[PDB]
């Protein structure tokens, strides 16, 4: 195979929606802070394995995830639980570590973003 898969779903009108202080925090503080990090750009959209000429990317990574998708999910109220969003961030980081090798610059970039992510998640507000 060579083609990219369709990108992850970001909206589903059939799913119930709610606003919570934790979901708001995840968009306003966590996602936004990570987005503006200098090393954020490789994580701001789905991996285009065609453009990058990486035909094995989607043979190795079967649960792709990226911050562009996460951001849109938050904006579309796709997540009911903060934990769903946190899981998507963790999937993004682990995919990077699984596909690439320890010494790669892209892994260094991911590790920097992850450190910041954990700092912000450690400050997650108690549910209101």
């Amino acid at each position: 195979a060579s083609m990219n898969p369709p990108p992850p779903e970001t909206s589903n009108p059939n799913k119930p929606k709610r606003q919570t202080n934790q979901l708001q925090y995840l968009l306003r503080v966590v996602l936004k802070t990570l987005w503006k990090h200098q090393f954020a750009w490789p994580f701001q959209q789905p991996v285009d394995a065609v453009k990058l000429n990486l035909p094995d990317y989607y043979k190795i990574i079967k649960t792709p995830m990226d911050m562009g998708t996460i951001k849109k999910r938050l904006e579309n109220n796709y997540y009911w639980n903060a934990q769903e969003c946190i899981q998507d961030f963790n999937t993004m980081f682990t995919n990077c570590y699984i596909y690439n090798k320890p010494g790669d610059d892209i892994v260094l970039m991911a590790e920097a973003l992850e450190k910041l992510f954990l700092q912000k998640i450690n400050e997650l507000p108690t549910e209101e």
């Binding site: 490789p42 701001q44 453009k51 990058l52 990486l54 690439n100 790669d104 892209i106």
Partner: peptide, 7 residues
């Protein structure tokens, strides 16, 4: 690698 220089 190219993954850290283009998207």
């Amino acid at each position: 690698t190219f993954k850290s220089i283009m998207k």
